């Protein structure tokens, strides 16, 4: 009747398996445990179901470790892809024989996936402007710590850089701005050991 998942978040690379724990207390003699996935675009996808009575159920890359006496359920994902960045919920499904039984969900765990390939690459910088809006784009860089900046005498606004993962496996980051001048604005991104401006790459 109560379900808990104490893991706030977990981070694992692409080729490393991850485990998610679920500790529950129930007075029901026979029940089921359901695992659900909540994508960043809100949607619940049914991953796996483990009956309290049957054996351990394995489906695809998801396996379940079931402890009846200790009442613990663990979900293991082996060789997870890049799409496994969603939230994972463990629901103590009440005996599903009726059509009216609810699911007792818990505070889900968040899984974040880091890229597998680890080569070193030099970022390439560019500056793109529309009116008074300026955006500095740094592309094809592996080192997460860039601290990209822009040079300008007048500072109207500034937004935090957005860093995401390119389909090639590298990182791509973008900055923005609402600087007063357009021609004089120049970007500059710091490599993990060097630094480059927008004077070159032109």
């Amino acid at each position: 009747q109560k379900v808990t998942q104490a893991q706030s978040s977990v981070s694992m690379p692409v080729r490393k398996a991850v485990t998610l724990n679920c500790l529950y207390e129930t007075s029901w003699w026979s029940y089921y445990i359901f695992w659900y996935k909540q994508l960043p675009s809100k949607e619940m996808i049914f991953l796996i179901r483990q009956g309290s009575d049957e054996q351990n159920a394995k489906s695809g890359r998801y396996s379940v470790n079931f402890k009846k006496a200790a009442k613990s359920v663990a979900l293991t994902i082996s060789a997870l892809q890049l799409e496994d960045s969603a939230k994972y919920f463990c629901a103590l499904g009440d005996p599903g024989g009726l059509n009216t039984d609810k699911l007792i969900f818990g505070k889900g765990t968040r899984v974040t996936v880091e890229p597998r390939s680890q080569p070193h690459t030099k970022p390439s910088v560019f500056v793109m402007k529309n009116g008074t809006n300026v955006a500095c784009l740094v592309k094809e860089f592996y080192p997460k710590d860039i601290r990209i900046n822009l040079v300008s005498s007048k500072k109207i606004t500034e937004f935090d850089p957005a860093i995401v993962i390119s389909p090639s496996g590298k990182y791509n980051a973008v900055k923005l701005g609402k600087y007063e001048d357009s021609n004089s604005v120049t970007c500059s991104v710091q490599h993990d050991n060097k630094t480059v401006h927008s004077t070159d790459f032109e």
Partner: protein, 121 residues
């Protein structure tokens, strides 16, 4: 191969606390839990305890609750059970139990210890 080793038979006084040990070898102790069963010629055998090494959660039989407390050690990979008031007809064999890896055999106790005999005055 999966194996469980238990302590030998111990003679005990009418009032004392006795610790029975069980060591598991051949697999990872953290993943699977250890059940403890008591067999006596009059009452047969009944499930008396269950301990999960990973988190320490324990499940007891209602009649055996309070009488027996279990503890686990992952570094030594050994589970201990404590017994008290042993004079009250509690002379029986004690067995460890573990389900088959991956719960292949359902709730069947696939792996058993050799059993430790407890006799009281």
């Amino acid at each position: 191969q999966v194996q469980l080793q238990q302590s030998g038979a111990e003679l005990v006084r009418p009032g004392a606390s006795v610790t029975l040990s069980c060591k598991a070898s051949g697999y990872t102790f953290t993943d699977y839990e250890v059940y403890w069963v008591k067999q006596t010629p009059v009452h047969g055998l009944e499930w008396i305890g269950a301990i999960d090494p990973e988190t320490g959660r324990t499940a007891y039989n209602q009649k055996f609750k309070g009488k027996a407390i279990l503890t686990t050690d992952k570094s030594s990979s050994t589970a201990y059970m404590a017994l008290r008031s042993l004079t009250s007809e509690d002379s029986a064999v004690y067995y460890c139990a573990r389900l088959k890896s991956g719960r292949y055999y359902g709730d069947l106790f696939a792996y058993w210890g050799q059993g430790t005999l407890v006799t009281v005055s």
